[PDB]
Amino acid sequence: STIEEQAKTFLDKFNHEAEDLFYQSSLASWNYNTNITEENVQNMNNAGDKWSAFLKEQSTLAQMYPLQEIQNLTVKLQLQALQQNGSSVLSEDKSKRLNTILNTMSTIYSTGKVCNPDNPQECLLLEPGLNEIMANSLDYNERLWAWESWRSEVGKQLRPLYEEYVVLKNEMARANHYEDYGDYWRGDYEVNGVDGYDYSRGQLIEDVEHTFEEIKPLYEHLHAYVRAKLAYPSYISPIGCLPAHLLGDMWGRFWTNLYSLTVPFGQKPNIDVTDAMVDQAWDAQRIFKEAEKFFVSVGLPNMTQGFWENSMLTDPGNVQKAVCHPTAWDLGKGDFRILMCTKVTMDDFLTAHHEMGHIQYDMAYAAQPFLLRNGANEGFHEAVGEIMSLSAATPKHLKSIGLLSPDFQEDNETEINFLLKQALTIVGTLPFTYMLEKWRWMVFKGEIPKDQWMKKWWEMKREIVGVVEPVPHDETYCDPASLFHVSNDYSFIRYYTRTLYQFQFQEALCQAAKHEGPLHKCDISNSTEAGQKLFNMLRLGKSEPWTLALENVVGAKNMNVRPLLNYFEPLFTWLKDQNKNSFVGWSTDWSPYAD
Amino acid sequence: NCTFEYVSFKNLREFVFKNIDGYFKIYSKHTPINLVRDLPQGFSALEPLVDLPIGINITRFQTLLALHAAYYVGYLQPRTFLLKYNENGTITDAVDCALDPLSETKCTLKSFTVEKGIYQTSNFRVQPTESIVRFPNITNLCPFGEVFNATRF
Amino acid sequence: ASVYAWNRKRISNCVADYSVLYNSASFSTFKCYGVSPTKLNDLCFTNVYADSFVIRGDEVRQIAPGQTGKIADYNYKLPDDFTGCVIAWNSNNLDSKVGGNYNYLYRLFRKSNLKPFERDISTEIYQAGSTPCNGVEGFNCYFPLQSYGFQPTNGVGYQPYRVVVLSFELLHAPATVCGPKKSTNLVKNKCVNFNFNGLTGTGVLTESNKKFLPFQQFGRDIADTTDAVRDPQTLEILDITPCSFGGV
Ligand SMILES: *[C@@H]1O[C@H](CO)[C@@H](O[C@@H]2O[C@H](CO)[C@@H](O)[C@H](O)[C@H]2NC(C)=O)[C@H](O)[C@H]1NC(C)=O
Ligand SMILES: *[C@@H]1O[C@H](CO)[C@@H](O[C@@H]2O[C@H](CO)[C@@H](O)[C@H](O)[C@H]2NC(C)=O)[C@H](O)[C@H]1NC(C)=O
Ligand SMILES: *[C@@H]1O[C@H](CO)[C@@H](O)[C@H](O)[C@H]1NC(C)=O
Ligand SMILES: *[C@@H]1O[C@H](CO)[C@@H](O)[C@H](O)[C@H]1NC(C)=O
């Protein structure tokens, strides 16, 4: 009778159709990703077209339902998640222009190939060529050439395309009642209609900035220590910033490649149970079984057998080609699989445990309707996967299952090495994530003029990240678009948010598990209370605001890096002690190209 | 609606059908005969064949014939009978008490053969032909009519 | 069968052995309402209605007297005075497949609830609002049945579960479907409390000499007391002597 009841019935029918349609699309995608054939691409295209047409038709037929007269919170959330026209809010011409520009920039990024002047034929892509060149090879000249060529032959092409994509995104967000496309992406975290749990889009910016300011002393000390360790004293001033190419990657996102150049104690062996796993003859199935046993130990339910009979864990030979990217497939209608090319390594151990945490989260909110069968935001599922991998990475867990021999000792130097490596892996990209997200926000909102875009970037690179470009780049360069997310229209704040979520969740679990000792030694094994507390929010998924889940887990309704401070406090003290003679911070004026 | 299903002149086939307490019982007897007009004046027994827990309140019946004779139908009264079980329990003879006074004597003496003598069977009773109710006159009527026929109310 | 099209089988005129099924130990749910499973094994009924269908795991609890939900209201309803049983076993290897076992359908929309022992097959497009359906789905108009999604990967509450409801009828007609009436090996030349189809006598059983009729069951004396019994298991007559006793 009432419009709300009609909307509820329409959403129910949409879920009924979407179950089958998305299941067919997901099974076709799994077939393609386990066997790359032309027919697999054909059914992929067919399923994608069918799914997109169905979604657009349902969005059009649901947009006529007024959301202001609907008092049901879940129904309103489902309707607003279904009615989001997105880029279709513009005309067909503008929408197809935006799609073509996105495809072109993604193709340029993926096919970005640089050729050395010595041999024009000898060309290498960013991956695995340039990434290995500037991640493993320590030659300053080669890394500088790779970085400059990658940002030149790609940035110059992308800059007009990226500008047009930005303006199209801004105009569609304005047509979507958003001040800019940055606000459009911040709307994912937006919570409305819930007393004591509403979240605003600008609150995301405020929280990210506050957390970065809190991390600023720790990141300054880590940057000072890395600069003192850096390998390249001639090209790196002790007071000046760090070269972009000398950070293990083109964008300086991850400094773990500098770990060999920034190891606290090189004589201390790293914790790796790969050798024992080979001795114990562990394989992909054994690793998955041990991970399932660990998940059951914390209290989570036993995992399905259809997973084993359908999921691909090893390389399926060479007759058929399969995607080796770590993926947790929630195919819908109760179908949960994991696609991996799992080898006998500790890294694959942790990655498999991460994917299994993903699958546990996916099955937790499987009882939710189709619109609510997803994580709370872009950073919730990844947080669960990361905390599960970290719990699997603890020395206590490895010793308990026999992977780490009991005679192995844990000393302060080994703990410092582990903490510093975790820092370079996690907090190394946090300033980079913050600055790139702020640049994207200002670019979409339009504060940064075009003829100043790059001029702005390398400014905060020297200030926010303490990273200086080895050679100057003018506005023709589109170095931010040289990254995957900027050139593929992906929110980059998701990594910072998932880092904060995973730190908060890990601290809350350790408090619930009553861990004794350092936070980095906290293992949630044989802790049913921690597993139950995690399940209390895993089942919700996105059926409830993410602020409510965060409050239920850690007692705080908003972001904070206090768990990160607790985790890195021994490392923070060690870095502060080491940087007594090394200048802490960076110098923006100094640059490698200026003598 | 089906609630039950079952599958199993020179000759005379006799049958007795009765429904008691929801159980339908059939007692059959197939015999060789040499006659074409009326029932033989002899004796035979009827043994049960089928009982069915159906209880369908059956009140009417009709025979069924196939189109490419004669038959007889009686009725059953709630009578008292005496039966003579033989050495191995085959009903050799029976007597109906209500048939006639001699039969009543046989029933009350528990013997097919009655010794000469006088025997009491029952007690003749004359039932009331009707009922009569007698009361005194009803002359003493109350003044209901005066309220009914009240000129002034 | 589908839950909205649950198949009803009428069972009568046979011995019903619920002991094997109750002890088969291959079923997820076994809820006998108003009667113990072992007790109903030695119990008679006039009719047994077996309503067979397939539902999800979470819908299994909906099959009970006084229950609500889409399955309990639009697909099938159980009476509050339900004397039968509910049996349920997984059919994931049977009623699920990779790609989706879509043959089963469940009624999700109906103008009203269902009566007990009522099956709804109507496929009328349910009108949630005021827009006439006119036989097609549109705004405020959707199919009453949704296809079941059953795969070998589904969760416990989503796997295909085969459920049969055994409704026991004891109407005015005499009972037909009864239990095994568990027999016991008999003895002889011994003072034993014997029972033969309800005779429940007491004494000593001996080999007989008298011959019964094929339709006969037990004998009697002139004083109208049980003396001979034909064994129901094997057709032979046995004489009965009362238990030995006397004065002291
Ligand atoms: C048993 O009934 C039949 C029917 O008249 C008769 O059977 C005779 O006696 C026994 C069986 O009990 C057998 O020898 C034969 O079946 C019959 N006898 C002969 C000589 O053929 C008899 O009336 C009854 N039995 C007895 C002993 O009287
Ligand atoms: C009930 O079942 C038992 C077990 O088979 C039957 O006993 C056998 O019956 C067959 C034929 O009926 C005979 O050939 C065997 O000799 C019997 N066994 C023994 C040990 O004697 C029994 O007959 C069945 N009941 C009825 C009424 O047939
Ligand atoms: C049979 O008829 C009687 C009254 O004539 C009624 O009370 C009873 O319920 C009926 N039973 C059946 C099975 O028709
Ligand atoms: C008065 O009494 C007479 C007597 O027969 C009767 O017929 C008449 O109906 C009565 N009328 C009233 C109003 O009582």
Numbering used by the authors:
A (entry chain E): 19 to 248, 251 to 615
B (entry chain D): 165 to 172, 186 to 245, 263 to 347
C (entry chain F): 348 to 595
The authors write:
We describe the development of a biologic that takes advantage of the proximity of the N-terminus of bound ACE2 to the three-fold symmetry axis of the spike protein to create an ultrapotent, trivalent ACE2 entry antagonist. Therefore, we sought trimeric scaffolds to fuse three ACE2 moieties and leverage the inherent symmetry of the spike trimer to maximize avidity. Thus, we determined a trimeric antagonist fused to the N-terminus of ACE2 would require a short peptide linker and would be less likely to form inter-spike interactions. The collagen VIII trimerization domain is significantly larger than the collagen XVIII domain (44.7 kDa and 19.3 kDa, respectively), but more importantly, previous studies reported that collagen VIII melts at ~45 °C66, whereas the collagen XVIII domain melts at ~85 °C (vide infra). Given these observations, the smaller, more thermally stable collagen XVIII trimerization domain was advanced to develop the trimeric antagonist.
Next, variable lengths of glycine-serine peptide linkers (0, 1, 3, 5, 18 amino acids) were tested to bridge the trimerization domain and ACE2 domains. To simplify the nomenclature, we refer to these constructs as TXA, where ‘T’ indicates the collagen XVIII trimerization domain, ‘X’ refers to the number of residues in the linker, and ‘A’ refers to ACE2. Analysis of the other complexes, both with longer (5 and 18 amino acids) and shorter (“zero” amino acids) linker lengths, was conducted to better understand the role of the linker with respect to the symmetry of the trimeric antagonist. Notably, we did not observe discernible density for the collagen XVIII trimerization domains of the longer linker length constructs (T5A or T18A), whereas we did observe clear density connecting the trimerization domain and ACE2 in the zero-linker length, T0A. We then attempted to evaluate the ‘symmetry of interaction’ between our ACE2 constructs with spike protein (T0A-S, T3A-S, T5A-S, and T18A-S; where S is the SARS-CoV-2 spike HexaPro protein) by likening the C3 symmetry to an equilateral triangle with all sides being equal length and a corresponding standard deviation between these lengths of zero (s.d. = 0). Thus, we calculated lengths (distances) and corresponding standard deviations between the Cα atoms of equivalent residues in the RBDs of the spike protein (residue D428; as determined by Fan et al.) and in each of the ACE2 domains (residue N137; arbitrarily determined residue on ACE2) (red and black dashed lines, respectively). The calculated mean distances and s.d. between spike RBD were: 41 ± 3.6 Å for T0A-S; 40 ± 1.0 Å for T3A-S; 40 ± 1.0 Å for T5A-S; and 42 ± 3.2 Å for T18A-S. Equating lower s.d. values to symmetry, we determine T3A and T5A to have higher symmetry than T0A or T18A.
